[PDB]
Amino acid sequence: PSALTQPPSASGSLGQSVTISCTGTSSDVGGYNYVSWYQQHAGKAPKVIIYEVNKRPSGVPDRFSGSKSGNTASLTVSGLQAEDEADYYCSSYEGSDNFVFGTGTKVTVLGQPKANPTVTLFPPSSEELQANKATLVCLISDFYPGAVTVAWKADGSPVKAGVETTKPSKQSNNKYAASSYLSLTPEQWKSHRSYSCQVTHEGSTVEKTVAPTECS
Amino acid sequence: PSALTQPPSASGSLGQSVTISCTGTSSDVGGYNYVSWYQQHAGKAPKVIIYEVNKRPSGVPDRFSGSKSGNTASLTVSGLQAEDEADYYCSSYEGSDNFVFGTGTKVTVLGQPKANPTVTLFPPSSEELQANKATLVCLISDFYPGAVTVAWKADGSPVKAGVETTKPSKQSNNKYAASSYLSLTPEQWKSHRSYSCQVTHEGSTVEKTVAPTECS
């Protein structure tokens, strides 16, 4: 169908500015002042930030700002936030009712701070044990950057099998959220002393411990 | 803005037709003879498949079909293909600008059997409540095709107030895992009769309910 030409990265720093350009033909990004810009995250429900060459929707202040030149449009997103970590697709009207779009993109917002994790490790519930099954979640919260290496242990010597650790994904605080489950049979749970979760974030271990002799 | 609520996963074997139904909310999304539809592939640029309720674009096949009920706008793909595999989204407008987008739907060509989520809900620990923290986890495991919609309750009244959820990651056994949390104060917890976690997949919806207990 033939697509509009953009840059694939538009890196700024936390409160700088960024120009994303989107370029077409005299038939599209040049013929009509009907160019739109769209903000989309990581699998998420996908917002429109500016609608009719330059004009903004219902709340997006006057920091999401856009312009056309001739054959080129440009989105000059001012004073970088952290939230804005997103894929910014452009569009424009072709004629004869159909609409033409921009290439596969991403803005990297640089110099955001580093969070070392909140590791929350749970018991198996009094629903689960009653079901004759046992599973323990190691929740790995609000961390940046999106690299963690999870490992588990039984009394002190590793568990590799039982374990199933999820990948990194954004919290909409725009840090990261990830998990890991170790699935037991309640005989295998009630036998022991310690059952620990050991997580490696940026050259530091965060080990939490959980045990039997409780009310459950 | 916000609300247009479609299916999480819409699955189908190659041949076997699929319909994607998108329901709306009480004002705007009624006496509205618009609603367009989009497809978004791997990394690539989004494409317009249906425009204004039922019409199509130029390079679009005889395969695709959008319609009216009242609240719900369908999209019946007839003749399913590997080419057709993608995320898909339904649109609209209000204000002039104030244009609402769908919650998203995977279209999957089944290459593995269908599984419906083993949805385990945990309370916060004896210890975590010693720590003055309160967080619950809804662990959603062992599912295929790999798009789940999640939803939390506080005394049956639906939260969108403390909730972070993860993108669905493929396990050791070729099926999937996700995880949702709710964070509160140890009093925000204690203050209620019950909390719950509800998960929409294909045919399925599945709740699971925890009540605050003292362990004292």
Partner: peptide
């Protein structure tokens, strides 16, 4: 989402 009938 768009522009317009146009």
């Amino acid at each position: 989402q768009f522009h317009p009938x146009x």
